[PDB]
Structure 1
Amino acid sequence: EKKERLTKEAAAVAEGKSKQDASPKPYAVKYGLNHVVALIENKKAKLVLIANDVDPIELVVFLPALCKKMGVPYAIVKGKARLGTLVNQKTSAVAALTEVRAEDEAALAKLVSTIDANFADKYDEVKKHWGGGILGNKAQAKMDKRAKNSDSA
């Protein structure tokens, strides 16, 4: 499409007028991590999606806390490959949507509210506490039966 758009502008712009300004505004999602972090703190970004996975991990640990401090409505969507697909990459890590068509304005606002109710209400707790207490099943059998059988003759 980019290639097509370059050819179209040359035919219109030289002959009549304009600085490429004839072409309409582009609305699209913002995929680069550095760019989105830069979009946050302005603060211009209405939604951020953060992939749960990512091999460094340290890369994206700060982003939930940073979004909270700035007050961007963040989410943690499952899978980085999914984010990739919407943005024409193999993997995207984060995706933020900064602008919206007037028709699409209503839908965006209500999604953010859903995310706050669905994510933000229950996850004051999530900041707190330590995951991964869980034991393997052979060890679970051993703890339960020892504890249970000791109590009851």
Structure 2
Amino acid sequence: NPLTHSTPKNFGIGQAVQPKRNLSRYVKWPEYVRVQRQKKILSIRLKVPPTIAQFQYTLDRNTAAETFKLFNKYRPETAAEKKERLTKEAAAVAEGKSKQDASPKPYAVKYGLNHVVALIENKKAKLVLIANDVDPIELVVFLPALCKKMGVPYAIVKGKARLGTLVNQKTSAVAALTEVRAEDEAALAKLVSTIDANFADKYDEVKKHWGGGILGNKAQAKMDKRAKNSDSA
């Protein structure tokens, strides 16, 4: 009201300098950015073979929540924890004259790619989590087949890092359980089943199913409205 004034402002071509807007759509990203974006794009436009593409079919967040929840209990040894263990047995064992077995059998998550393979190969593994990233995808592509053929149940789970946390590495690639405290055997059988249902059961049909071949939306719409009009007037 006072001696204050409503002016508006005509931003309509040929007048008023354009205001500052959000151009985040338009910014000229560094090459390294443009690469990793378009790589993900190129990797979709191409029809991708069924032995890739059987990834992307990842776990769902809930079942995996339950599965990290388990695998957590069986983490490997901490630096200290084993120092502590050693300074137990070393002192103890060597004197009290226990047969290097004043230490309790350890139940832990098995890890490292080569380790877990021999485990699957030996039908000793009992539920294998496989990562969904893993950039030379080859390290891992043969694992669904393996677990299938060794009758080992498995799951493709989101996060090589998230696997890495439960083992104290940055990244892991795979995590597996072979052992289990009987107090958890029950949880796992239930866990196993869901997983088998989502993967190792569905495997054979997934092996028939190619991937990608997906248009981007500027040209999705292009034909969702070309094919909308042409056929049905």
Give me the TM-score of the superposition, normalised by structure 2. Answer: 0.62
Of 139-148 and 113-122, deviating more is: 113-122
Match of 2:116 in 1: 36
**Taking structure 1 as reference, are residues 67 and 123 closer, same or farther at Cα in structure 2, changes over 3 Å only?**
closer
The structure showing larger relative contact order (alpha-carbon pairs under 8 Å, at least 6 residues apart) is 2
Residues 80-104 of structure 1 show CA distances to partners (whole Å, capped at 9, x for unaligned) of: 1111011111001001101111211
Residues 125-147 of structure 1 show CA distances to partners (whole Å, capped at 9, x for unaligned) of: 32212111211111112222222
Larger % of helix: which? 1
Structure 1: state its 5+ residue gaps: none
How far residue 11 of structure 1 moved from its aligned partner, in angstroms, is 2.2
Give me the TM-score of the superposition, normalised by structure 1. Answer: 0.92
**Taking structure 1 as reference, are residues 13 and 152 closer, same or farther at Cα in structure 2, changes over 3 Å only?**
closer
How far residue 121 of structure 1 moved from its aligned partner, in angstroms, is 4.2
Q: Distance in 2 between matches of 1:15 and 1:9?
A: 9
**Taking structure 1 as reference, are residues 146 and 67 closer, same or farther at Cα in structure 2, changes over 3 Å only?**
same
Aligned match for 2:104, one of 18, 24, 31: 24
Of 107-116 and 31-40, deviating more is: 107-116
CA contact (8 A) 2:153 2:200 kept: no
Of 100-109 and 63-72, deviating more is: 100-109
Structure 2: state its 5+ residue gaps: 1-80
Aligned match for 2:149, one of 52, 61, 69: 69
How far residue 10 of structure 1 moved from its aligned partner, in angstroms, is 2.2
Task: Name the SS of the counterpart of 2:170 in structure 1.
Answer: coil
Of 43-52 and 130-139, deviating more is: 130-139
Q: Distance in 2 between matches of 1:105 and 1:152?
A: 58
Identity %: 100
Task: Name the SS of the counterpart of 1:48 in structure 2.
Answer: strand
- Structure having the higher Rg: 2
How far residue 23 of structure 1 moved from its aligned partner, in angstroms, is 0.8
How far residue 152 of structure 1 moved from its aligned partner, in angstroms, is 4.7
Residues 1-20 of structure 1 show CA distances to partners (whole Å, capped at 9, x for unaligned) of: 11111111122122220232
Q: Distance in 2 between matches of 1:51 and 1:3?
A: 31
Match of 2:38 in 1: none
Q: Distance in 2 between matches of 1:109 and 1:76?
A: 17
Q: Distance in 2 between matches of 1:51 and 1:38?
A: 17
Of 110-119 and 46-55, deviating more is: 110-119
CA contact (8 A) 2:111 2:174 kept: yes
Of 124-133 and 79-88, deviating more is: 124-133
Task: Name the SS of the counterpart of 2:129 in structure 1.
Answer: strand
CA contact (8 A) 2:133 2:159 kept: yes
CA contact (8 A) 2:144 2:200 kept: no
Question: What is the RMSD of the two structures over their aligned residues, measured on CA atoms?
Answer: 1.5
Residues 28-80 of structure 1 show CA distances to partners (whole Å, capped at 9, x for unaligned) of: 01111101001112110110000011110011000001111111001111111
